[PDB]
Amino acid sequence: NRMKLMIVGNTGSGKTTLLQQTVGIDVKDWPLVLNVWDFAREEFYSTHPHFMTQRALYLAVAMKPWLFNIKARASSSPVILVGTAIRDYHFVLAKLRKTIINESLNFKIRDVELEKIILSERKNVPIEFPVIDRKRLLQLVRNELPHAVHFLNESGVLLHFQDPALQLSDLYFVEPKWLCKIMAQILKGIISRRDVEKFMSQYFKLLEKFQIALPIGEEYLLVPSSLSDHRPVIELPHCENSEIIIRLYEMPYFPMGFWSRLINRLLEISPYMLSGALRPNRMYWRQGIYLNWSPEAYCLVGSEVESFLKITVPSCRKGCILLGQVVDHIDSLMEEWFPGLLTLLKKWALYSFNDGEEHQKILLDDLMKKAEEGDLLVNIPISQIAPDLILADLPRNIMLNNDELEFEQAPEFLLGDGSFGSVYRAAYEGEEVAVKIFNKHTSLRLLRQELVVLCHLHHPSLISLLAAGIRPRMLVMELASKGSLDRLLQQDKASLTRTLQHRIALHVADGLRYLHSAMIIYRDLKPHNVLLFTLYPNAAIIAKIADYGTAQYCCRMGIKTSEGTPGFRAPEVARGNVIYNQQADVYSFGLLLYDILTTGGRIVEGLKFPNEFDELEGKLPDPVKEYGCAPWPMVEKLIKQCLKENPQERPTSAQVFDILNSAELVCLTRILLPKNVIVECMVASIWLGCQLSFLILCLALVHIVSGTCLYCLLVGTGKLAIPLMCLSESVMWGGCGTKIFSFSIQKLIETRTSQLFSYAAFSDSNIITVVVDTALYIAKQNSPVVEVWDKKTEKLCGLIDCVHFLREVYSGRVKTLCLQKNTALWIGTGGGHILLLDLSTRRLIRVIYNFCNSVRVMMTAQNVMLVLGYNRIQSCLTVWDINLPHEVQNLEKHIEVRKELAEKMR
Ligand SMILES: C[C@@H]1CN(c2cc(-c3n[nH]c4ccc(OC5(C)CC5)cc34)ncn2)C[C@H](C)O1
Ligand SMILES: Nc1nc2c(ncn2[C@@H]2O[C@H](COP(=O)(O)OP(=O)(O)O)[C@@H](O)[C@H]2O)c(=O)[nH]1
Ligand SMILES: [Mg+2]
C-alpha cells in the first residue's frame, strides 16, 4: 500500500500550499501509506531530472518539459492537472482529494516478500550524515539483496545508485530527504571548491555526477545551473552571410537538463576539436557556450528566440570542421540522453544567394535529399551550407573517387555482415580492399558515427580507412589478409599457437586501451569483429578491430542505451536499466580471451544451444576442465579478473594491456602442493622427496636411488663414492667443502684466495652448486655473490652480485644455479625472485617477481624449466618454458616496434 506521490510543476503555482489541506525536493507521509515527494524558481531542473522512478503518481500544476520528463521516465503514470496520458484536470479542493485516492487505487490495477523487515531496519536507524557503506552486519544480525534494495529504492525508503558510471554503488543513502537538500544547496556562478568546503571527497564527486558542479579546473566548479540568464554582447569576427554558417535546432521546448548536459559535453571535447590538443577561450551564459581558437576558427552555440538552438561557425575549413563535430556531438547527446525528440526535432540549414539579404532556411532532410543527387543548390554549393552532409568537414584525403572503385556487391563477394551494413570484397585504386554498404533504410547518422570512430583515431590495432562517400554511402577501409578471428577459431584450429594467440589478445587489448583513451566505448567485442592480417607470430600487426557501427562517445557521464550481441556483453548491459561505463568493454575482452584460450568451445556450444549462451554469459565453467585445453596460468587469472560482476573490480583496458605485456604471463606453464608438505629435492611424471613422494636428502633417475648429492652412479657425503655437495658434467666436475675439485682428482682449485674481494664470511662458505661452462660459476651458503673462475688458469675471473641487480630493479642470497644452452643463467635467490643473466654480457635480462617467497631447488626437464619454491609453510612446484629469456627480448622488441608505429600513424 506504499504509493508514491510526486507533485511536479512550475514554481509559485502553490503546489506546496495545495497539499497543506523551494530549497529542494520535500517529503511527507499521508494515510494506504502515501509517500509524497514535493518538488520545487528554476535552477533545480538539471539537478533532479532523475527522481521520477516508475511506481509513482504525478500531479502537474503551460510547462511541457515537466510532462516530457514524466513521459520519458515513468511512461505508465497518472497525471492529474490542477489549476490555480492525462487522466483528469481539476481546478482550485476536497473533490480533487477523492480523485487522487481514486487515481492511486486505479493506478495499481492499471499498472509481497521479505522486504518488510529490511525496510523497517533501514528506516529505524538514525545517523548523522546518514549515508552508510555496505553494512552487511545489520542484516546478518537480523543473491536476493540487490533485488530487495532495488524495490526499497523504488519505494522511497532509501536511494541506492547502483549505476556503474556513478561509483555510488557501495554507499547507501538513508532517509532520502537529506540527499535532496545537501545536493541542492550549492547554488556569477563560477564558485570555487574552497567556498563550498566552508559549508567532502565524495560530496564533490556526487555533485558532478548529477550535472550540478562540473570540474572546469583545480579548485573550480562551473555550476551551470547558476550562470547568467543573458548572453553578453558578442561581436564575431565575421558578420557577412558568405562568411558564417548557421544551423538551427528547433524544438517544442528545451528538455529538462538539456543545456547543462550540452555544456558539459562541449567543454570536455574542446581541447580536441581541431587536432583530435589546444585549449580555446570559453564563455558561459547557461544557454550557450562560445569557443574561440582564432578569428578564423571559432564556434558559437546558443539559443535564439520556438526554443531554437543556433550553431554559428565561420565559413572556412576549420569552421566546417567545428560545425561537423558540434553537430555530431549534439546528435550523440540527444540519442543517449533525450530519446523522444527523434519528429519533434527540426533541423534547418540557413543560406542566402547574395550577401546582405535576409536568411532563408531549408529543412535538413530536404537538403540531404538534394545532396543525394548533387553537390550544388539550385535557386552556392552545399559544401558552404551544410558541409557535414557531403562529408566536406572531414579530411580531404579520405574522399571517395568513384571512378577508381570496382565494386560488384555479389553474394559471392561477401566478407561479413556488419552492425548496420554489409562488408564486401572490392577493388579501389588497383588494390584489394573491403567495402561496407549500409542497407537501404539507413541514415547519414550511422555513417557519421562510424566515421567519427574511423577518421580521428589511428592505431596499429584499429582498422584503417581509405575512402568514404555519400552517393552510394560506402566505407572503403582495407582487406584483412587472413579473415576474422571466428573463422580461425572454428575452422583452422591447428594454426593457433600459444605465442600467436597471446599476440592476438595483446593487440586487441592495445586497441581497446587506445579506444578508451579517446573517450570511445566499443560496446561489442567478439571474434567476428576481430580481424587477422597474418598468422606469423613475430609480425608487428596480427590483429585489428573493425565494425565500429556500435561505438559511441563515453564521457564521464556514461552511456544509457544498450548495444551488443547476446553472449559477448557485460551483465550490466544485458539488463538495460543502468548506465554503464567502459568496463563493459573490459568484460567483453575477458569473454574474448576466454574464447581465445578455449578456441571454439563456448561459441561452438552456443551455435548448438541458443538463448542459453547469453544466459550463461552470471557464471561460466573453468576453461581447463570444461573444454580440456592446455593450462595457461596467469591468463586464467586475468580471465577471472575481467569476468567480474562489479565493473569497478574489473581492471581498466590499460591495466589489462599491462598485465598481458609480460613474458612471465606467456612462458608460465604452476602446480601447488598440499599444505605443510615441504620438499627438499626432486627428480624427473616427477619424483619428489620430503618420505618419498610422487606427482631423504637426494634423488636420481637411474635407467630410484634415495640418499648429500647424487647423479645417475656417484655418491657424495665429503667422501666421494662412484662435506661434498657439488657435482656436474658439461668432462665432469664438482666441489667439496670450501674448494672446487675435479676429476676425469685432476684439478684441486682451492678457492679461499677470493677473501680479498667481498666479505670473508661470504668468501669462506660451503659450496652450494658449481656450473661447468667456459667459465666456472660458483655460489656458496648464504652468499649473495656468485664467483666466476677460469678452468684454464685456475684463477678467479670476476664476482657478480645479485643484490646489485635486485637494488637496481629481497634476501638476495643464492640458493641454486642452472645454465641454459642459449647463454642464459638462472639463479634462485633466497627470496622468491629469479634472475636471468646473459652469460657473455653479464647483463640482467629480467627479474621474476611475485613468483613465491623462497626458492629451494631448481632444474630442467622435458623442454621446460622446473623451479620449486616455498611460501613461508607451503611449497609450490612451477614449470617455466625454457624459452623465457628470448621471449622477454622478443616481447620487448615487439612492443617497441609497434609502439613506434602508433606515434607514426598519427
Ligand atoms: C577468408 C577471407 C575473408 N576475409 C575477410 C575480410 C574481412 C575484412 N577485411 N577487412 C574488413 C573490414 C571490415 C570488416 O567488417 C567486419 C568486421 C564487419 C565484418 C571486415 C573486414 N572480414 C572477414 N573476412 C578476407 C579474405 C582475404 O579472406
Ligand atoms: N492567495 C493565494 N496564493 C497563492 C495561490 N497559489 C499560490 N499562491 C502563493 O504561492 C506561494 C507558494 O509557492 P510554491 O508554488 O509552493 O513554491 P514552490 O514549492 O517552490 O513551487 C504561497 O506563498 C502563496 O502565497 C492561490 O491560489 N491563492
Ligand atoms: Mg515548495
Coordinates of C-alpha atoms and ligand atoms in Angstrom, one line a residue, residues 11-12 14-17 22-24 26 38-40, ligand 3:
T11 CA 7.5 27.3 -9.1
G12 CA 4.9 29.6 -7.4
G14 CA 1.2 27.0 -4.8
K15 CA 1.6 23.2 -5.0
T16 CA 3.1 23.1 -1.6
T17 CA 0.1 25.0 -0.3
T22 CA 11.6 25.9 -2.5
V23 CA 15.1 24.7 -1.4
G24 CA 14.8 21.3 -3.0
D26 CA 10.5 17.8 0.1
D38 CA 7.0 17.7 -3.2
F39 CA 9.3 19.1 -6.0
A40 CA 10.4 22.7 -6.3
Ligands
MG3 MG 7.6 24.2 -2.0

